[PDB]
Write a protein that binds this DNA or RNA. Structure first.
Lengths: 110, 103, 46, 142, 117, 56
RNA sequence: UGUAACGGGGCUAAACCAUGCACCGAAGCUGCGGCAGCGACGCUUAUGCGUUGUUGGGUAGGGGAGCGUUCUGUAAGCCUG
RNA sequence: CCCGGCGAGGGGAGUGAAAAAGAACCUGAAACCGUGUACGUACAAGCAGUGGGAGCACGCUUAGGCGUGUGACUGCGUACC
C-alpha cells in the first residue's frame, strides 16, 4: 500500500545519499532501520527519520499493517544548489555550490 | 509451379495466388494483365527455354493498387566548400495477385 | 507575509563576477610578468 | 523478394578429415579455408559461419617446394623492449608442428570474431590418430 | 517591427533530434552535434543505395559458383554456355533456385554443357 | 592535468562501481535482554553477553 | 623501436614471355519508372500536347522561382470554455 | 490529527473549478540529473554511423502478415566550420 514520504531542501549531495538508498530496495522495513541505525553516515540519520514518518504516516492515515510491509520505490533527485564563494590566491574567487537533495520514499506491502 | 518473367526490366519469381510489388504501370485498378515474357516455368517436372518466352508460355495476374512507395531523404554535402542540398523522393509501385499459370 | 528567509546567494554572485573581472582584467601580466623570467628563456628569439 | 539468408539454428554442419602427407602447404590451406568459410556451399551467408568441421592429421609429414624448409621464417614479437624472435620452418616442425597449418590458415581467413570462430572448427594433429571419432569423420581427400 | 524567435527554433531542433533518435551519447541529445551526424548519415545512404546492388551481385555469384562446382562446373563457363544457348535469366532468380530447388538448377546445368559442347 | 576532452556519464558510472557500500548483513541477539547489537560491541543499555556493567 | 623494399597469407607456379577464349568488376552505357530546364514541330495557340532530341557535378560568383514568424487593412467577419 | 527536535520538511483532513493554483506560489520546454521496464553487452580494437542482417520482447491484428523497440555478426567508411 501507499503512504509515501519525502524530505526536501536537505543539505547534502544526492550522490552521497544515493549510496544508502542502494542498501535498501525491496527490503523488509524492520531490517532497514536495523541496517541504517548501525550504518555510519550523516545521511542514515537523515533518511531514517523520513522512513520512520512514512510508517507513522500510514497507520493513522491508512490501514497500517506494518509487520507485512516493504520498501518499493526509493529514489533521490537533486534540489537547488546555493551559490557561495571560497576565495583563493592571487585575488581570484571561486563559485562553490552547496548542493541539496530531495528525497522520496514509497513503502508498501507489495 | 513457380515461374519467372519480366515486368520493369528486372525479373521476378512467383507462384499462384501471392502478392507482388512491381513497377508502376498504366492500367485499370482491378482489371487484369498477361505476360509473354516468361523466362522459365517449374513444377514437380521442369520446363525451360533455349530462347526467351518459352513456346506458349503465359502468365495472368490481377492488378490491385497503384500506391506510392515509402519516402527517402536524399542529401548532397561537401565539407568546407559551402555546398549542401536536400531532396526527397517517393517511388510508384503496382501491387498485383496471380490468377493462374499455364505452359 | 510568509516569505522564505532571504537568499543572498546573488550577493556572493555579484562579488564573484566583480572579483573575477577585477583581477582577471587589471592583474594584467602578473602571471606573465612572473612568466616574464620564463618569458626571457622560454622564448628562443634565436 | 528478400533473398534467402542462413540462420544459425537451421545450419547443418559436418565433419571431414585430411592426411597432409605429401601435400603442398599453401595449396592445401586455401581449400581448408574455403570449406571453413562456406564458399563451397549454396547457402553461404558471409556474416554466418557455414563451414564444416575439419580434422587434419600427420601434419609433420607435410612438404614444401624448394629451399623454404631451411629458408622460410616465422616472426613473432613479445611486446617487450622491441625484442623479436624468429623460428625456421625446420625448427617449428621439430617443436610445434601443429602451429604451421594452424598459422597459414589464419592469414587466409578474415580478421574479427567470425574468423576466430571458424578457426575453432579446425583440429590438427602431428599423429595419425584422433579421439573425435564419436562425431564421425565422413572421409575427405584432396 | 520586432520579432521574437523562441519557437520555430525548437521546431528545427526537435525535428532533427527525432532523426537522431537511437544514436549514442551526445549525438542523440545536443543539436550542435546531431546536425552534423544526420547530414553525414544521409550521404552514407546516397552512397549505400549505390553499392548494395554490388553487395548482392557479388553474393549471388558466390551462391552459384559453389553449386556449379557441386554439379562439376565453374561459374564462368556455366554462364557463357547459356549466352550461347540464349538464356537471359538474371543472376538474382538463379541463385534463389540453388537454395530451394536443386533439381532445376542441376537439370539446367546439363543444358550449358550440351550447347557449350 | 588538463583533461583534453570530457569523459562520459557512463564512464564515471563505472568508476563509481566499486565505490558502492557493503552492508553489515549480520547482527546478534543478547544472551539475556534479547536486544539487537553488533558482535563484540555493547548494547545501548550496556548488556554484553548477558552481563550488566555501565548502569547509566 | 619490431617481421618490414610483394598489402599479408602464402606462391616453383598462384612468377616472367608468347597465344587464345571466357569471366569479374564504376554512380560509365543500356533496361523500367519518375521530376525539371531548353528547341521545332501543327494543331494548340500564356495550351494540351504529340512529340523529338538534348541537357541537368559544381566553389567565387550571376540570374530565376519560392517556404515560413511578427505587424497592418480586408475583419464589430471566421474558430474557439 | 500524525511523523518530526513543543524544528525544517512532510503526509492526512479541509477550502477552493482546479492544490497537475500551496508562496520558491499561470504556463513549466532543453541541456543536466535519477527511479522504473523490454532488449543487448565481460575473446572483444578505431568519428561510433549507414546498408544488410538473425535472434529476443511487444501491439496490432488477422489467422497471414504488419508495425514498434533492441540489436548479436558482416561490407564500406579517418567529424564541422
Amino acid at each position: 500500500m501507499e503512504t509515501i514520504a519525502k524530505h526536501r531542501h536537505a543539505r547534502s549531495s544526492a550522490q552521497k545519499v544515493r549510496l544508502v538508498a542502494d542498501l535498501i530496495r525491496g527490503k523488509k522495513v524492520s531490517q532497514a532501520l536495523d541496517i541504517l541505525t548501525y550504518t555510519n553516515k550523516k545521511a542514515a540519520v537523515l533518511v531514517k527519520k523520513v522512513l520512520e514518518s512514512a510508517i507513522a504516516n500510514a497507520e493513522h492515515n491508512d490501514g497500517a499493517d506494518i509487520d507485512d510491509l516493504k520498501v518499493t520505490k526509493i529514489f533521490v533527485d537533486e534540489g537547488p544548489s546555493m551559490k557561495r564563494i571560497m576565495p583563493r590566491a592571487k585575488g581570484r574567487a571561486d563559485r562553490i555550490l552547496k548542493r541539496t537533495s530531495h528525497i522520496t520514499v514509497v513503502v508498501s506491502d507489495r | 509451379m513457380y515461374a519467372v518473367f519480366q515486368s520493369g526490366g528486372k525479373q521476378h519469381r512467383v507462384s499462384e495466388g501471392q502478392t507482388v510489388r512491381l513497377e508502376k504501370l498504366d492500367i485499370a485498378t482491378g482489371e487484369t494483365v498477361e505476360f509473354a515474357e516468361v523466362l522459365m516455368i517449374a513444377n514437380g517436372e521442369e520446363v525451360k527455354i533455349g530462347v526467351p518466352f518459352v513456346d506458349g508460355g503465359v502468365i495472368k495476374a490481377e492488378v490491385v493498387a497503384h500506391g506510392r512507395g515509402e519516402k527517402v531523404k536524399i542529401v548532397k554535402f561537401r565539407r568546407r566548400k559551402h555546398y549542401r542540398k536536400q531532396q526527397g523522393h517517393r517511388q510508384w509501385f503496382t501491387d498485383v495477385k496471380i490468377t493462374g499459370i499455364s505452359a | 507575509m510568509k516569505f522564505v528567509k532571504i537568499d543572498s546567494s546573488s550577493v556572493d554572485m555579484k562579488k564573484y563576477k566583480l572579483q573575477n573581472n577585477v583581477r582577471r582584467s587589471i592583474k594584467s601580466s602578473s602571471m606573465n610578468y612572473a612568466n616574464v623570467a620564463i618569458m626571457t628563456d622560454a622564448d628562443h628569439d634565436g | 523478394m528478400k533473398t534467402f539468408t542462413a540462420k544459425p539454428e537451421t545450419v547443418k554442419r559436418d565433419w571431414y578429415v585430411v592426411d597432409a602427407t605429401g601435400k603442398t602447404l599453401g595449396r592445401l590451406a586455401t581449400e581448408l579455408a574455403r570449406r571453413l568459410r562456406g564458399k563451397h556451399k549454396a547457402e553461404y551467408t558471409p556474416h554466418v559461419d557455414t563451414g564444416d568441421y575439419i580434422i587434419v592429421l600427420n601434419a609433420d609429414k607435410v612438404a614444401v617446394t624448394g629451399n623454404k624448409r631451411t629458408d622460410k621464417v616465422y616472426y613473432h614479437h613479445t611486446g617487450h623492449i622491441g625484442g623479436i624472435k624468429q623460428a625456421t620452418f625446420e625448427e617449428m616442425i621439430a617443436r610445434r608442428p601443429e602451429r604451421v597449418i594452424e598459422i597459414a590458415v589464419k592469414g587466409m581467413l578474415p580478421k574479427g570474431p567470425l574468423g576466430r570462430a571458424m578457426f575453432r572448427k579446425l583440429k590438427v594433429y602431428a599423429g595419425n590418430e584422433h579421439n573425435h571419432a564419436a562425431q564421425q569423420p565422413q572421409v575427405l581427400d584432396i | 517591427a520586432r520579432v521574437k524567435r523562441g519557437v520555430i527554433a525548437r521546431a528545427r531542433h526537435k525535428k532533427i533530434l527525432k532523426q537522431a533518435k537511437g544514436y549514442y551519447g551526445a549525438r542523440s541529445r545536443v543539436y550542435r552535434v546531431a546536425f552534423q551526424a544526420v547530414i553525414k548519415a544521409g550521404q552514407y545512404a546516397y552512397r549505400d543505395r549505390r553499392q548494395r546492388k554490388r553487395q548482392f551481385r557479388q553474393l549471388w555469384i558466390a551462391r552459384i559458383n559453389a553449386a556449379a562446382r557441386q554439379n562439376g562446373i565453374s561459374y564462368s563457363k556455366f554462364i557463357n554456355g547459356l549466352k550461347k544457348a540464349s538464356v537471359e535469366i538474371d543472376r538474382k532468380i538463379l541463385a534463389d533456385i540453388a537454395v530451394f530447388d536443386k533439381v532445376a538448377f542441376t537439370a539446367l546445368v546439363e543444358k550449358a554443357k550440351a550447347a557449350l559442347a | 592535468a588538463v583533461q583534453q576532452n570530457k569523459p562520459t556519464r557512463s564512464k564515471r558510472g563505472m568508476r563509481r562501481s566499486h565505490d558502492a557500500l557493503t552492508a553489515v548483513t549480520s547482527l546478534s541477539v543478547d544472551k539475556t535482554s534479547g536486544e539487537k547489537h553488533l558482535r563484540h560491541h555493547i548494547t545501548a543499555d550496556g548488556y554484553y553477553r548477558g552481563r550488566k556493567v555501565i548502569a547509566k
